[PDB]
Design a protein around this ligand. Sequence first.
Ligand SMILES: CCCCCCCCO[C@@H]1O[C@H](CO)[C@@H](O)[C@H](O)[C@H]1O
Ligand SMILES: CC(C)C[C@H](N)C(=O)O
Ligand SMILES: CCCCCCCC
Ligand SMILES: CCCCCCCC
Ligand code: NA
Ligand code: NA
Length: 491
Amino acid sequence: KREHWATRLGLILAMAGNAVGLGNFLRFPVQAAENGGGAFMIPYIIAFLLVGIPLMWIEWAMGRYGGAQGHGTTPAIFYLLWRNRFAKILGVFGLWIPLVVAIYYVYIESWTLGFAIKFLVGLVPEPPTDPDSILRPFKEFLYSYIGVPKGDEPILKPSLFAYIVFLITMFINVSILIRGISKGIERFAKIAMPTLFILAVFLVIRVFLLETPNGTAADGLNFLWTPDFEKLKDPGVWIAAVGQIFFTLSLGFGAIITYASYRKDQDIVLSGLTAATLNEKAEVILGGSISIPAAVAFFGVANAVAIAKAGAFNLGFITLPAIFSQTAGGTFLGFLWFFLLFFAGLTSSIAIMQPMIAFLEDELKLSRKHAVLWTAAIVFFSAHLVMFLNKSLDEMDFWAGTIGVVFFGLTELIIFFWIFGADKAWEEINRGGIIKVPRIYYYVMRYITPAFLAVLLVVWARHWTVWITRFYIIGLFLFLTFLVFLAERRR
Ligand SMILES: CCCCCCCCO[C@@H]1O[C@H](CO)[C@@H](O)[C@H](O)[C@H]1O
Ligand SMILES: CC(C)C[C@H](N)C(=O)O
Ligand SMILES: CCCCCCCC
Ligand SMILES: CCCCCCCC
Ligand code: NA
Ligand code: NA
C-alpha cells in the first residue's frame, strides 16, 4: 500500500517545510536587493497572485488526482491527463528537475551544517577598523571551506571538513527519507517548522536592534518596502520576480505533486493557500528582515545593494557572520543563523528527493529502502561535479532551477487546463472541500498565467567546464527517460 500523511495538518506542515527553505533566507534578500528592494516587491506580489498561487493549486490537484490512482510522479500523472507518449517524455522533467536541483541544493545545505558546527564550537575568524578588514577574514573563511581557487581555475579544492560534513548531510537526509512519509518527513516537519519560526523571530528581533552611524535596521526595511513604480517597466525586474516566485513555492519542481499524492482526503484550496501564505510570511517578514536590514544598518543601502550583487552567498555566508561578529555573542548569533538555514534547507531537500524516490517506489515497484538508497547514490555521486568543478553549480541552477521550472510550470498548465480540459481541471481543483477558488482565477489559470509565462519566456531570449555539466545533466535526462521506458514495459 502507498504511504499516507497521517493528518491533513501534517501534510500542510510538511508542505510548508517544502516551500520554506534557503530561498526565503538566502535567495530572496539577494534578489530583492539586486532589483531595488521596494521596486522588486510590486512585480513579486503580482507574480505571486498571477503565477504562484494558481500554480500551487494546480500541482496539488494533479498530485492528489494522480495519487488516488497510485501515481505520484509526473511521467505517470501526465499520461493520465494526456494519453500520449510525448506526455511521458515531458514528464521526465518532473524527475530530472528535482534530481539536478537536489545535487547542488543538498551541497549548499551542507555548508550551513558545517558553518553551524564551527560557529557553535567557536572555530570562526578573528578580527581586531575599515569594513574590508572585518569582511575579508570571513570571505577567506568561506573560500577555504568550499575550495575556491585564488583567481580563476576550473577546479575547486574543497576542505576535508566540507566533504565529510556533506556526507553527514546526505546521511541525515537519508535517515529522514528512509523512515517514510508519515513516520519520517511528517514527523520531522512537525518539529522543524516551529524551530524555524522561533529562530527566525529571534534573529529578526536581534537584527532590528542594530544601529550604526551609517544605517539603521529600519532603514533596510524602508529600502525593502518603499515601492518605486518607475522601475516597473524594467523587464529584468519581472524576470527576477517570477523566477523567485517559482523557487520559493517549489513550483515546477515536481515536489508539490508527489507530496500531494499521499493524501486523497484533502482540501487543496485551503491547504495550498495556507502553505503559500506560510511561505510568503517566512520570505518577506522573516527572511526579508534579517539579511537586508543588518547589511543596511552596518554599511548603508548603497553598499548593501553592491554586496548582494557580488555573489549569491556573499550576504548570508560572509556579510551576516561578519556583522554578527561585531556584536556581543555574535558568534552564537552566527550559529543560530546557519542552524536556522540548515533546518530550512533540510526540510526542502527531503522534498525534492522524494519525487525520484516515489518514481522508483510506484513505477518500478522498488522498496522504500532501496528507493531512498539508490536516489541518494545518484545525488551523492553527481554532487562531486558541483564540489570540484568551478561554475558547475551555477550551470545546474540555471538549466534546472531557473529556466527548467518556468518551462515545466507552463507545461503542467497546458496539460492540465488545455489538453485535459479547463472545466475538468476546475472541477478537480475545487472538488472535495468547503473552500472554493473564486471564479476569477479560472480565467487567470486558463489565459493569463500561460500567456504571462510565455510572454515572459520569449522576452527572456534577449570556459569548457560548463560543457561537462551540460553533458552530464543531459545524460541524467537520458537515464531517467530510460527508466520511464523500463517502467512502461513492466506495466
Ligand atoms: C563515488 C566517487 C567518490 C569519490 C571520492 C573522492 C573523495 C575526494 O575527497 C578529497 O579528499 C581531500 C582530503 O584532503 C579533500 O581535500 C577534499 O575533500 C577532496 O579533494
Ligand atoms: C524545494 C526547493 C527547490 C526550494 C525551496 N522552496 C527553497 O526556497 O529553499
Ligand atoms: C585528492 C585526490 C583526488 C581528488 C579528486 C577526486 C575527486 C573526484
Ligand atoms: C587533481 C585534482 C583534480 C580533481 C578533478 C575532479 C574532476 C571531477
Ligand atoms: Na521558499
Ligand atoms: Na525546508
